[PDB]
Symmetry: C4
Subunit: 481 residues, 4 copies
C-alpha cells in the first residue's frame, strides 16, 4: 500500500517528464522543415548542370563537369535576380557570400616505383595532413592562391567520404552578384585552379528563410580521389538561431527551464539512491537506464548551453552583409544535439516499462524477456561471429566491384538488407559469377533458414518454461491447500 | 437438433446477404474504371510540360514551371480540337469550364525577428484561416482579383499535403476554347497573379465518358509552402451520377432495395436479442461484430440516401453548358461511401467464422485463437511502445532529410516497410552516417530478430496448451470408462 | 526381402523414366532461346518510335503514337535492307508479310442517358461479340474496309488484357518491301482507318532463324479501351516446326518414342493395380499422384500428336512466299504443351518421395508432414477467408487508382507480394491517405505478425508430437523387455 | 588443468594466426580500390556512345552501335590529350596499346533444313571450337584479317556469357594516338571486319595508376549470338604487380613469410595428430575443418608463388612502350587468389568456435546445433528436391521470356530472391498470365508458409530436447544425492 503509492509518485513525476520532453521534441522538429531542404536540394543537386547537359550535381564524373557546375547551375541557383541581393525562390535570403575552398597535396608526396621512373614524372599521395600542400602556387596574388591555416579561417575538420578533410586550404570568397562571381570563377578556371593536386573542393553558403525563421547551411563537398574522378557529396542543415520571436518559442523556453529542473530532480534522486546502496544499484536494469538517461541529458544541456546557444558569429555577421558567416560550428553542434536528443527520447520511452507491470500477463512477458537475455546474448555472440565472417568474405570478394560492399561497415549493412530482402543481385552476379552465387545461396541457407530460427528457438523454449513454471507454481499452491 | 436448425436458418439468411453484397460490390467497381483514370493521369500528369522541358506535373519545382504547365500541357490536354466543345481522347466530354483558384496569406502575417528588420521587409506565415488574405489586389477588376467567401462559391475544405485548405479564395473560371483560356491565363501571368503570398492553387474540372457512363472529377492541387517551392498533388475520382440506363443498373437498384430490407432484418434481430440479454450481449464477439456491421451499414444507407443520391447540381448544370459544375461534394461523399462499403464488406466476410466451426480441427483452431487474444494484446502493447519509441527516434533523426520519415505517421509506416523489407537505405545512410546505421541495425536486431518472434512464441505455447488440453480431456474421459 | 526387391524394380524403372524426361526437357528448352526473344523485343518494343520521340511500344499513350509506330519503328524493324526480302538483324528471315487487323464496335451499341442526348451524339460499347461491327466502312474497296468472318481468315479468339478478342475483323496484309508497306499504311492513315469505333489492333508476323532453326511468331496487340487510350501488349513465341535436321533431334525423337512406351507401361500398371483394389486406391497419396501424372502425360502425348505435329500450314506456306503464314494455332498449342510439360515434370519430381523413405529420420519427417495436412488444410481455409476479405477490401479501396490492385486476382497476388516484401507503398499512400495506411498496418499486423505464425505453430506441435510418440514407442518397447 | 593449458596454447597460437591473416586481408584490399574501378566503369560503360545517342556500352543493341562505340566513346575515353601518351583522367597511364580481337565461325557450319534451302543461303552455327573459322578473309593483308592461333598470341579461354570463347582469333593492335587508332578503326569498318560470322569481339587494354600504384586490366567483351544481337560484358580487375615500394608493403611481405611459417606449423601439427589416430580423426568436425583450411592455404601459397609472383610480362613490357602487355593471366590468377583468400579467411573465422565453449550456455548452444545437423540434412534433401522441382518448372515456363529465369542456375537464385522478397512480378505476370500466378502463389504457399517453417520446427524441438535433457540430468544428479 506504500509501494503502490511510491509507484504512483514516480509515475506522476515521470509522465509529466515525458509530456515536457515530447513538447520539446515537437518544438524542435518544426512541422515542415523537410520541404525546405528538399527544395534547396532539388535546386542545387537535381537540376541539370547546363542546357546542353544531363548531369546533376549528384552524378558528377570529371573535373570539367565540376567547372560547368560552378559556372552554370550554381550561379543559376544562388543568384535569383529579384523581380542589392538575391532571394532564392523569392523567399530565402542568401546571407553574405558563398565561399569555395580547395585542399591540395604536394607533388612527390608518394613514391613512384623504380622501373617506372622513366615514364611517370609526378605522383600525388592520398590526402592526409602530412601530405598537404602549404606552398603558394599559380599567380600567387590573392587569397585563392596562398595557403591559409585552419586556425585563421575558423574552419574545422570535415569527415567526408574517403578521408577526414581539414579546415585549412585555399579559400576564395565569392561576391554578391552573379556577374562578379562568374568573373571570379572564370578567372579561377582560366589560371587553372583545380589541377592534379586537388583532393577536395568545398562550396559553403548559408541562406535564411524569414517566413518560418530557419537558417540553412549548405555545404557541397566534391572529393577528387587519388584515382582520378569526382565523388560529390552534400549537407543541408537547418539551424534555428533566433529563438525568441513567437509565443510558442517562449513556451519552448519555459519547457527548457522545466526540463533542466526535471534533470536536476532525477540526478539528485539517483545520487540519493546511490548513497544508500553502494553497488546494489547497477545490478538492476532500470537504475542503469536512469544512469544512461541522466548522462545523455546532462550532455544535452551542456551542448545547448555551452555550444549551440553561442550566437557570437550571428551578431558579428550582422555588422556587415558582405563577408562569410561562419555557420559551420553551429551546424555541427546542431547535428550533435539532434542525435543526443533523439537517443534521450528513445531511452525515456524505454524507461516506461517500469510502469506497465500492472497485469499478470505483463508480468509473464517481462519475466520471459528477462530470463532469455543471457542465452540470446550467447547466441548473439555466435551469430555475430558467423555474420562478420560472411561480411569479411563479401568484402574480400566484392570490395572492388560493388557499391554495396565498398567498405566493411557497408558490407555489414548490406548483409542486414539481404536478410530483410533488399537485394541488388544483378551487380553481385556480374561482379563474380562463381562466388556471387555461392556466397548468396550459403548466406541465405545458413542465416535465413537456420541461424535466424535459433533466436526464435531460444525465445520459444524460454516462454514455454516461464508459463509452465508459473502455472505449476499456482497448481502446487492450490494442491498444497 | 434445434440449435443446428437455428444455425441453418441464420446461415441461409447470411449467405443470401453475402451474395447480395458481393453483387453490389461487383456493380460498384465497374470492370475497367482503372484504365479511365490512368489515361486521364497519363494525359495530365505524366506528359512533359512543353516540348523544350522534361518536367511532368508530378515533378514541378518552382512557380515558372507552374505557369508553363498552365499555359502548355494543361491546354494541350483539356482542349482536344475535334476532328463547339472539346472531347478529351475523342471520347471524354469536358463538362463546362475548368476553374482555377488561389489561396493567399496576408503580408506581415508572421513576425520578423528584431535584428533582421533592417534587411528583410515582408514575411508570410504558414497558411491558416487566421492568416488568410481577404483584401482585393492587383487590377481588382474581375473575379480573379477579389476575394470570394467559401459559402459563396459552394466549396469545401480540402485536406491537402501540408495544410487543410479552405474552399474560399480567388477563383477564375476559364472558357470553352483553347484561345480564350490561353488569353485569360496570359492575362493572369502578365499582371502577376501568383506572387509571394500564394499558398495553394486548385485546378478543378470534370469530364464525362458516355461510352461507359462515368463522370471524372479532376482536382489538381499545387501547394506553395512558406519555404518556397511547389508540392504538386492530384485527385481523380470517378463518379457515377446517372444510374438508370442499363438493365444491370435496374438489377443493382433492386439489390439496393433488397440490401435495405436485409439491414432492417438484422437491426430488428439484434434489437430483439438485446431486449432479452441486457448486457449478456457484448460479452461475446459475434454480437459486437454484428453491431459494427449494422452501424456501418446504416451509415452507408444514410450516405447513399441523404448525400450521394442528391443530383441537384447535375440537373442544375444541364440548363446551361457554360458554367462550372460543382462536383466537389458528390466526389467527397463517393469517397466516403467507398470507404464505408469496403469496410462493411470486410467485416461481413469476417462474420463468416460463426459458421465454419463444423469440424473438430476448426474448433481447435478457433479455441486456440480465442485463448491467445489476451496475451497477444499485452504483447501488442509492449511491442507498440518500443515501436513508437523507434518511430520517434527516426522522426527526430531523419525528419529533415528523408521523404520516408517526413511526418510521424510516415515514420510508423516506413518502419512497417523496414520490417517487411522495403528499404531505401541509401538515403538513410547519406542523411546521417552514424545513427542511420545504428538505428537500422538495432531496429533489425531488436524487432525482426527478437521482438517479432515473441508473438510467435505466444502462439506456439497457446496452441500446444490447447491441443494438449483437448487430448488430455479425451484421454481422461477414456480412462474414466 | 520381396518388398525391397519390388521397390528396387519400381525405382530402376522410375529413374530411367526421370532421365528420359529430363533429356526431353533439355531438348525442348534449347540453351539460349531467351536471347532470341530479347533481341526481337528490344528491336520492336524498346526502340523509340521516331527520332523526335521518346515513347516505346511499351508506353504508348494515344492513337497518333500508334500511327507513328506503324509508320516508323515497325518499318525500321521489319525491313532491314540487306547489305528480294529482309533479314532481320541480318540473320532472321521475315516469312512472307505482316498482317494488321482491326476489331470494331457498332455506333449506338450502348445507350446514352436521357438528359445528355442533346450534347453527346454517338456512343460505343465495351467490346463483345454482340457489339461487334460487321458493316463495311470507309472507301469499302479493299480487304481492309470489309468485314471478314473468323472462319474465313483462320484466326482464333485472343485473350487480351481487358477482353477476349475474336479472330475476325478487318485485316490488311502488308507487303514485302518497306516502300509498299509504308504506302499502304499511309493510305490507311489518310482515309482514317482507326476511328472512335476501334477496340483492338493486331500486328501479326513470323520470322525464322536458320542458324539455330527456330520460328518466332510475333503478335503485337494494341487495345483501345472504351475509355479512350491505348493498352499495348506483345507476345513472342518461339516455335520449332522442322524437327529432323540434327543428330540430337533424332535422339530426341527416339526419346519421344521411349517416353510413349513408358507412359503405356505406367497406364497399364495403374490399371492393373486398380483392377485389384476397387477403391482401396485413391485412399493413398501416391496412386492419386500417379493418376495425375498419367492424365497429364496422355494429354501431352495427345497435344504433341494431334495438334503440334500438324505442319500443314508450313508446307502450304512454302508454295508461295508472298502470303501470310497462319502460325497462330501452332504457337497456341506450343504454349499449351509447354505448360503441360512443365507441370508433368514437376509432379514427376514430386513422385520421387516414394523412394527416399530409406532412413529413420526421413520416416520421421514424412510421418510428420502426413499428420499435419488435415490441420494445415483447416487453417488454410481460415487464412484464405481472411486473405480474400483483405483482397476484396483492397479491390474496393484501390481498384480505381493503383495498377497493383486493378483486377481482383491482381489484388490477391499483390497481397502475396506484400507478405513477402515487394511493396510500392508510395502509390498506395497517395491513392488513399487514410485507408491506405490502415489497410497496410492491419494487414501487416494481422498476417505477418499473427496469422503467418499459426501455420508454424501447427507444424511445431505436430513435429514435437511425432518425435515424442516415436521416442516413447521405442522407450516402451525397451521397458517392456 | 593440462587440457586447459593445451587450449590456452592452441588459442594463443590461433589468435596470432588470425591477427596475421586479418593484416594480410587489410593489405590486400587497399582502402579505396572501388572508386578506381567505378571511375573506369563510368568512363567506359556509362558514358553515351556519341552526342546524338543515348546508348551506353551496357545497353548495346546492334552492330552499328558497336561501331559507333569503337569510333566514339572508346576513343574519347582511352585518349585523353594531355594538357607522347595519354593519361586517363590525367592520372592513369595507358600502358602501350589496346587490342581488339574477333572470333568467327565458318560459313555452313550448321545445316539448313530441306524445304528452306531455296530461300536461305548461308547459316552460321553457335560458337564452338569445331565451328571456328581459320580461313583468312577480306583484304588478307594484315594481322586483323589472318587467323592467329591461341598459342601464338598468348591468350587463354575466356568464359563469357553464352559460350567459352577461346584465346585465338583475328587480333589488331591499335596505336598510341587517337588519330592513328581512329584511322585503323575506320579502315576496319570500311572493309567490313564484323559481318555475319562474328561471334565475339574483345577489347583488351591495361592502365596503371602511379598515385596508389595499381594496374587495371580492362576487358570489354561483346558477344554476338547466333540469334543476332549484342550482349555486352565487361571486366575490371585491379592488379598489384610492383610490391616493394612502401614501408607497409615490406610489413606485408614480412607477414607473408610469417603466414607461410604458420601454415608449416599447422600442417606439421595435423600430420602429427593423424600419425596417432589413423581414422579417429575425420570423425570429428574441427579436424576436418583444419584439413580444409590447410588445403586452401597450401593452394593459396602455391598460387602466390608459382603464378601471381611471375612478373616476366611486366619487365618484358618495360623494354618497349609500343606493344601490348599480356596481363590476362596475372588478372586470372589474381581472381583465383582473391577467391581462395576470402574462403580461407571465412573458414579461419569459423574455426574460432573451438574456443568459445567457455560458458554453460555456450555448451548448450553448441550441443544443440550439433544434435540437429542430421535432421536438418534430411530435411535439406527434401526441401532441395521440391526447390529444384519448382526451379525446373520455372525454367520450362519462363525460360524464353524473363531475364531472371534465363538459365537454370538463375532460376535457382531467382527463387532464393523470391523467398527473401526481391520480386519483379510484372515481367512474370506478362510472360505467362496463367502459370505465372499459379507458380507464384503455390511457391509462396508451399515454401514461405509451410516448408520454410519446418527447419524451424526441427530447431525448436531439438533445442527444447537439449535444454530439458541437461536440466533433467542435473535434477537427477541433485535427487540422487
Ligand atoms: C613534380 O615532382 C617531380 C619529382 O618529384 C619533378 O621532377 C617535377 O618537375 C615536379 N613537377 C611540378 C610541376 O612540380
Ligand atoms: C593577379 O590578380 C588579378 C585579379 O585582380 C588577376 O586578374 C590576374 O590574373 C593575377 N595575375 C596573374 C599574373 O595571373
Ligand atoms: C509588406 O509589409 C511590410 C511590413 O509588414 C511593409 O513595410 C511593406 O511595405 C509591405 N509590402 C507590401 C507589398 O504590401
Ligand atoms: C481590367 O480587366 C481587363 C479584362 O477585361 C484586363 O485586360 C485589364 O488588364 C484589367 N485592368 C488592368 C488595369 O489591369
Ligand atoms: C451514330 O449514331 C447516332 C445515333 O445512334 C447517329 O445520330 C449518328 O448520326 C451516327 N453517326 C455515325 C457517324 O454513324
Ligand atoms: C480505292 O482503293 C485504292 C487502292 O487501290 C485507294 O488508293 C483509294 O483511295 C480507294 N478509293 C477511295 C475513294 O478512297
Ligand atoms: C556460304 O555457304 C553457302 C553454302 O554453304 C554457299 O552457297 C555460299 O556461297 C557461301 N557464301 C559465302 C559468302 O561464303
Ligand atoms: C591493305 O592494307 C592497307 C593498310 O596498310 C589498307 O589500307 C588496304 O585497304 C589493304 N588492301 C585492300 C585491298 O583492302
Ligand atoms: Ca522478407
Amino acid at each position: 500500500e506504500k509501494y503502490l503509492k511510491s509507484v504512483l509518485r514516480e509515475l506522476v513525476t515521470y509522465l509529466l517528464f515525458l509530456i515536457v520532453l515530447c513538447i520539446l521534441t515537437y518544438g524542435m522538429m518544426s512541422s515542415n522543415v523537410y520541404y525546405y531542404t528538399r527544395m534547396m536540394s532539388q535546386l542545387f543537386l537535381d537540376t541539370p548542370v547546363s542546357k546542353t547537359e544531363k548531369t546533376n550535381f549528384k552524378t558528377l564524373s570529371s573535373m570539367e563537369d565540376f567547372w560547368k557546375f560552378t559556372e552554370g547551375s550554381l550561379l543559376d541557383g544562388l543568384y535569383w535576380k529579384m523581380q542589392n541581393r538575391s532571394f532564392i525562390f523569392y523567399e530565402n535570403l542568401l546571407l553574405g557570400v558563398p565561399r569555395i575552398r580547395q585542399l591540395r597535396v604536394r607533388n612527390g608526396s608518394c613514391s613512384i616505383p623504380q622501373d617506372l621512373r622513366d615514364e611517370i614524372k609526378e605522383c600525388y599521395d592520398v590526402y592526409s595532413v602530412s601530405s598537404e600542400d602549404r606552398a603558394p602556387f599559380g599567380p600567387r596574388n590573392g587569397t585563392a592562391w596562398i595557403y591559409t591555416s585552419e586556425k585563421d579561417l575558423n574552419g574545422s575538420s570535415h569527415w567526408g567520404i574517403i578521408a577526414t578533410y581539414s579546415g585549412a586550404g585555399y579559400y576564395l570568397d565569392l561576391s554578391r552578384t552573379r556577374e562578379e562571381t562568374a568573373a571570379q570563377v572564370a578567372s579561377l578556371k582560366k589560371n587553372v585552379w583545380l589541377d592534379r593536386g586537388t583532393r577536395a573542393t568545398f562550396i559553403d553558403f548559408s541562406v535564411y528563410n524569414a517566413n518560418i525563421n530557419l537558417f540553412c547551411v549548405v555545404r557541397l563537398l566534391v572529393e577528387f580521389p587519388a584515382t582520378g574522378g569526382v565523388i560529390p557529396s552534400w549537407q543541408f542543415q537547418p539551424l534555428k538561431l533566433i529563438r525568441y520571436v513567437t509565443t510558442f518559442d517562449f513556451f519552448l523556453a519555459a519547457c527548457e527551464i522545466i526540463f533542466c529542473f526535471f534533470i536536476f530532480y532525477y540526478v539528485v534522486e539517483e545520487i540519493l539512491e546511490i548513497r544508500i546502496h553502494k553497488l546494489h544499484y547497477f545490478r538492476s536494469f532500470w537504475n542503469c537506464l536512469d544512469v544512461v538517461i541522466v548522462v545523455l541529458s546532462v550532455v544535452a544541456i551542456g551542448i545547448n548551453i555551452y555550444r549551440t546557444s553561442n550566437v557570437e558569429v550571428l551578431l558579428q555577421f550582422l555588422e556587415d552583409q558582405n563577408t562569410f558567416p561562419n555557420f559551420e560550428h553551429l551546424a555541427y553542434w546542431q547535428i550533435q544535439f539532434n542525435n543526443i536528443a533523439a537517443v534521450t527520447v528513445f531511452f525515456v520511452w524505454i524507461k516506461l516499462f517500469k510502469f506497465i507491470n500492472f497485469n499478470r500477463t505483463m508480468s509473464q512477458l517481462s519475466t520471459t524477456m528477462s530470463r532469455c537475455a543471457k542465452d540470446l546474448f550467447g547466441f548473439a555472440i555466435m551469430f555475430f561471429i558467423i555474420f562478420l565472417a560472411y561480411a569479411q568474405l563479401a568484402y574480400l570478394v566484392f570490395g572492388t566491384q560493388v557499391d554495396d560492399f565498398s567498405t566493411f561497415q557497408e558490407c555489414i549493412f548490406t548483409q542486414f538488407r539481404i536478410i530483410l530482402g533488399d537485394i541488388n543481385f544483378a551487380e553481385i552476379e556480374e561482379a563474380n559469377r562463381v562466388l556471387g552465387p555461392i556466397y548468396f545461396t550459403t548466406f541465405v541457407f545458413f542465416m535465413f533458414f537456420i541461424l535466424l530460427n535459433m533466436f526464435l528457438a531460444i525465445i520459444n523454449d524460454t516462454y514455454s518454461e516461464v508459463k509452465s513454471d508459473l502455472a505449476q507454481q499456482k497448481a502446487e499452491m492450490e494442491l498444497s491447500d
